[model samples]
Target chain A: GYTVAVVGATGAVGAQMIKMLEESTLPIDKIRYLASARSAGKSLKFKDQDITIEETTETAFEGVDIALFSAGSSTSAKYAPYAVKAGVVVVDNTSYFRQNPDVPLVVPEVNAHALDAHNGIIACPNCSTIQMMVALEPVRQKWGLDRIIVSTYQAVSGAGMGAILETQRELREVLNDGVKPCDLHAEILPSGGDKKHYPIAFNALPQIDVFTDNDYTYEEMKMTKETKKIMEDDSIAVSATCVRIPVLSAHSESVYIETKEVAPIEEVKAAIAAFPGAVLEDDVAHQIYPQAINAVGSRDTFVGRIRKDLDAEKGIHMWVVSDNLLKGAAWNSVQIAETLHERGLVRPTAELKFELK
Target chain B: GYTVAVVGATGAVGAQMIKMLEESTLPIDKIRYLASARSAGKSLKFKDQDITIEETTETAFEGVDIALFSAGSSTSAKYAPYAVKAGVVVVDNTSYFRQNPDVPLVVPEVNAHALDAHNGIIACPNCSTIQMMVALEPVRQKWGLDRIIVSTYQAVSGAGMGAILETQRELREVLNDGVKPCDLHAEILPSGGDKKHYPIAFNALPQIDVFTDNDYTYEEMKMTKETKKIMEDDSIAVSATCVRIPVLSAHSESVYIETKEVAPIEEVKAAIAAFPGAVLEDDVAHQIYPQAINAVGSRDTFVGRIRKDLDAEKGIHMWVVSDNLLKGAAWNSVQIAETLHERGLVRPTAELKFEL
Candidate 1:
């Protein structure tokens, strides 16, 4: 039996984490909910039992066995090290420390073995990167992958709670008040921290995060960097264009890949259908393909519209969709915990390996 | 002075055609508005003068020097031949005669020379293909083009009046009535003539026209075939995925191309800025680029966000935008007419080049 704590328990992904725990496979002796001081004393129901939320701090992890962190990166940076010093495993859902060489960024289906040597803190990949890895890992195992080019049609929910509300309000203003889509006010999209904000109602903003030194948005760089880390192949070339669309839940990707070896379309489809955590919904004859609306609330990644490029013999194209909140953040974090328990790797290490600073 | 006829004058692109004709450079002695029987008596205003719509018939092109057709393909296929037989240079906006070898597919900016050898009818390229050509032609001239790969975020107005209305109604239902976007009643978007329709309120539909034998939609195929014909080069590789978004007028494209020569980024930008019918609005330092809202009423194609591919040395990526009705259909047709007049190519042919 294990005692688990959920940091940022009042957030959008944090709320979904609660639901995931209700149906999760982990053997839980107790569950603790932690949030900011603002949300303390609020009650959250878990397994039909009320659990009072508490303020997250260094002392909160004294008796906790595993802590799942979905709060922003700075909060994790402030408290995760303290939690790790107290002999509790921290699975962070923020982009902070994802590029840390010691922290094993685990997507259980793709690289569960990476969890065996965790340095007390494991990182979950970004919402967009996690879904792509789940869909492409099986295919890569069959036919060696060379290069990847992807364009994302992401939802507004990936930004946060304020973004979701802002998108909803903008939609109402444009539809109800007869205002133009561009005329609606915007404050938090295409990188809320950036200087300018753009409307997400019936428009696509190409910049997901702020522009990096190479002109690639930070969101694009994450897809490029995280894919290599998760696949453990630094040689795999990846390029991405992350754009925010008006969808609410799921993130859809238009991915094109060049395989190292030639594989038939039928065999490629079979490899994806046979893989776990992936559902194949491709039937062009019936107008069946994975849609963003159809993928909401589901834990599995849906893949469809697979076709071979006309000119490039080894090229393949696919459309992938997944609930960004569930599989992208909460469920993947919870699954890492389950895999740790099943493999007898949940106990904290006696020795501290990395510096807390 | 010449007599000009605008078929489908009561519809979306037809209305734009009336506006373009009112401000066109061509010397027009008379403007004739033609539509179906339903809108035959409706009046449209052009340059503050009222013009009554008339029914489209075989004799609608009598004494008319030029005719701009924006009706459906079936309508154009039925009546365009009669117009051509009357020695009218038919600039068909629909996809009816775009592939005919004798009919020159003209963009005026890229292949205006193709217009010089037109047999009788000149075909306007598809809206998606028209803007792409305007942006890539200058690059191709400087470095030579090899392959093109594009993903389009198209507007609903390209599908016509019903789609715009459907998109507006679906937005209201989803926002006001608590209806799911996927659950809205859709009959016009994705493919109006196909078996099923999908909502475009807050979603993207990958299928624009009906799917063909190779699993590519007819809309996607049009960009491929029309590019080869308009560029006069069948060896150039082209592929497209045409998706409809919930926009009103302008269409945006994410275009990637591989040039034959190693053209520097600055040189490529210069060529596009200097080209005719293309306005370069790329200034990343100031967050300036071609946006659909800013391009709603513009005649020239707006291009920006130009960058070199990280891996491929010869590759370039850009964002191109234009009003699908203006540069894509109405204004492009009117520009063709104006070019014909300026070059003395608008006279009636003495002999029919091909069977009508």
Candidate 2:
């Protein structure tokens, strides 16, 4: 049995982390909740126990075997290293250390072997990227993948609980108060750190995270860089156009891929269905396909609308949907914790080499 | 001066057709309103004058020089040919005769030349395809297009006015009545003609029309089939994934294209900006891009987010938005009619060769 701590355990992803850990397979003897000083002293329940929240600091990681950090990017930047130097393994759920050379970005179903050489820190991939890899890794295992072009219909909840509340409030103004979508005031969408905010109610915003120097938003580039890091393949060409739709929870994607070999439609469907953490919802004859409203609260990635491209012999397209909070952030971090304990790799590194370069 | 009739004069796209023709350059002396038998004697105002609705019978096409048909696919299949045989030059806005060899699918800015060979009936392309052609033609003219992959965020109004009402009512139920999106009943969405209905309120439906034999919906295949015909190129490979969002008015698309040559991003944006019916909104520094909420009543196709693909040298990506009722159907139809008037092509065909 291990002592587990959850950092930033008062927010949306944090609350889900508590819920996921409640029934998680990881054997835990004790549970601790950690948040910022603003949320410190509040109590949250884990299964049947009322755990008091403590403030995250340099001394918080003492005797804690594992700490799951779902705080802000800078919060992880400022605090995860403190947890690691105390011999505590940190499974970070922020974008700070994802591309770091020392950290291995793990999606257990796709790249469990990468967990063997972790430097006391394993980063979870982006919410949009996690579901995509779960749906595509099985296809890549059979037929070599060449290129990928994905367009995402993401939800507001991935931004946090504030974004979800902003979206809901905007919808109320539009539906009940009769305010227009363009005239509604928006405070937190299309990246909270960005310069502008746009209404995510009954509309789509093309920019996800802030725009990088190369003109692609950071959210789009995460799908590009994180896929390569998790899959351990540099030859795979990837491009993403991430858009924020008004859905409250689940993220739906329109993924198109070019395989090195011609993958038959039925065989590809079977491969996705048979893969772990993926469910096949493809039945065109019965109007049965994956939808966003049907994918909430589930750990499985639902895939459907599988068909080969009309012209390219090796191109295939499918729809992938999963709950952004559950499978995307919380469950993924908890599952990595379980995998670490199962592989007997929970022990800390011999030396504290935990500085983010 | 010509006698013009607007078929389906009481619907969403039809009202837009009337509004477009109100400011249209085509010379109109008498305006006629035609609808189903249910709206037979109802009156509608056209530019301050009351026009009585006439039932769309065979005798309704008498003395009508140009008729714009947009009632329904079946309504156009039945009545458009009657107007044609009555020596009326018809602009059909349904999906019936779009693939006909004799009828030319026309988008004025892209392939207005295709209108020169029309045989009595000229068909307007699908709303999704019309904006795509407008945005891609300038790029194709300079660098040539090899392939295209598009994912559409379509609106509910493209289904009809009733679908719009249903989406609004469902939104109210979810917001005011505390109903969950999945638990709410859906009467019409994801194609009313399909076997089942799904809620489009705060949801993304992958199906837009009835599923075809190849597992692609008719709306998706319409993009594939209509693009090749309007662009007059069978070699350009196109694929589409059409989804309906909870939008009330406009359709937005994430379009990726592989040009035949290495088109520079600056030059591609310049070409689209210089095109007639396209407005460039691609400034990311100012948070400017084509959005559905801003494109509600406009006729110009908005193109933005233009960038070179990170891997493919000849590949480019852009976002396109337009009103499905305006540029997608009504304004395109009226623009084609104006183009016909400019080239003296809006006469009754050499003979009545009309049949569905």
Candidate 3:
């Protein structure tokens, strides 16, 4: 049995990581809850256990074996190195060390073997990118992929609890019949660091995350660049158009991909069905395709509506949906930890590998 | 003075065309209202005159010089040929004749000369396409376009009044108490013709029209195919991603284009400003930009946030917005009629010549 730690035990994704661990197959002898100064001493419960979170410090890593992190990029940047130095194998759900050459960006269903090479931290892909790869990897494994065009219909919960509250309150005000669109209050969405914020109560904001120097939002670029990194194919063309819709839990994507070979649509469906983590819920005749509402709370990336493109012979279009907080962030981090444990790669010397290659 | 006929005079766009005509500079000797059987006797006041809408039969166009059709595609398909057979020059707002090889798909500022080749019908581009063209023509003229990638943030008004009512009512009901999404009633949107309907109160619907075999909606394909046809260039690549947002009037698009030359962002903004029907509303410093509420009552297509693409060197990105029903449909139709009158092409002719 392993001694486990939840590094961000109180955050949106951190809380989910704790929940996922409670439902996981991993046997834990002792569980430690870790948080930042703001969330320290917070009381949270597991199935039958009431646990109090402790402030995350280098000393706090003392008896912790496997730690799952979702605190955010900055905290991961500051303390992840320290946790690794304390002999803890960390599965980080942040952008901090993802682009670092040595750290493996692991999506268990797609690239679980990447964990074998991991020193300490195994990075999780963006919530939007993680779900998309899970759905598209089967097709890539079968026919190969050339290009991908994705437009996301993401949820407010992806932006955190504050964004969910903002959307709910704004919907309440608009339904009251007197609220003007310009007058609607928005503080956290479309990217907190953006120049301005727009109401996402009933509107879709194309800008997600702060606009990059290239005019594409950082969120859009994350999906684009991350596809190449996680898929390990720089030659594969990827462009993403991301929009934040007024959904609360799951993130949905309208994806168009051009396969390397002319594969039949049924073959593509069968391929998805054959994959472990990919679920095919496509029955268009019954309108039983994937949607965010039904996809919420699930760990699987649900895909549907596979069809041929009208003009391009090699192009195929599909709809990909998933619980953004689950496969996208929380459950994915835990999946990485599970992979490390399964592969016998959980090592105290994991921190030394970051400097090795 | 030419005799004028406003077909579909009581519709959302047709009513605006009448208002535009009342304020138009063209001198009209007589004005006649033509509508479908149900609205045949309805009267609409135009320029201090109460005009009775006659049944839009073949005889209704007997002496009509110009007929503006906006009643919808089917009604235009059924009766527009009759009006054209009677020698009435038609400006059709319905999608019926837009892709017709002989009809000139006109956005007067971009291609008023296309009207010169019109046999009888001058087709207006889709509301989404019109505003984008109006916003991009200046840049296209200066830099020459190679490709266009556009995703629309469209409005409910694009679907008409019934959609507006359904959206408003369902929104109110869903927010009233503990109303679940399933409890709300929806009669008219996503599409009236679609088999099932969903509440658009707080949701964004990707499907706008019946899904074509290609997985693109008919509405989205129209934006793609129409841009090429209107630009008179089949070589230029254009793609459209149309999504219905909860906005009520103006349709906004995030337009990414690769120009033949390296076009400066400021130069593109200047070109849009210099164009006749477009207004440059970009001022990021002041948070001044094109918006649906401000564009609600205007005929101008607003272009803003002009910038160079980060990855593609030849590419430029801009935001184009406009009142869909106005510039995209009604106002543009009336403006075309006004353009036709100014060019002295307003006379009613029997069997107008159209080169195939």
The best candidate by TM-score is 2
**Tens digits of per-residue lDDT for model 2 on B273-334?**
99999999988998899999888889999999999999999999999999999999999999
* TM-score per candidate: 0.97, 0.99, 0.88
Q: Which stretches of candidate 2 lie over 4 Å from their true place?
A: none
Worst 10 residues of 3 chain B by lDDT: B347-356
Task: Give the per-residue lDDT digits (tens) of candidate 3, residues B287-338.
Answer: 4556665677788988776776545678676777787888878889889989
CAPRI tier for the interface of model 2: high
Candidate 3 residue B56 Cα shift, in angstroms, is: 3.5
lDDT of 2 at B349: 77
Interface CA RMSD of each prediction in angstroms: 1.9, 0.8, 3.7
User: What are the lDDT scores of the predictions, listed in order?
Assistant: 0.85, 0.91, 0.78
**Segments of candidate 1 deviating more than 4 angstroms:** B353-356
Give chain B TM-scores in order.
Answer: 0.97, 0.98, 0.95
Top model number, DockQ: 2
Quality of model 1 by C-alpha lDDT: 0.85
A70-160, model 3: which lDDT tens digit per residue?
A: 7877778877777777888888888878888888887888888777777778788899999999999999998999877676777889888
* DockQ of candidate 3 (2 decimals): 0.26
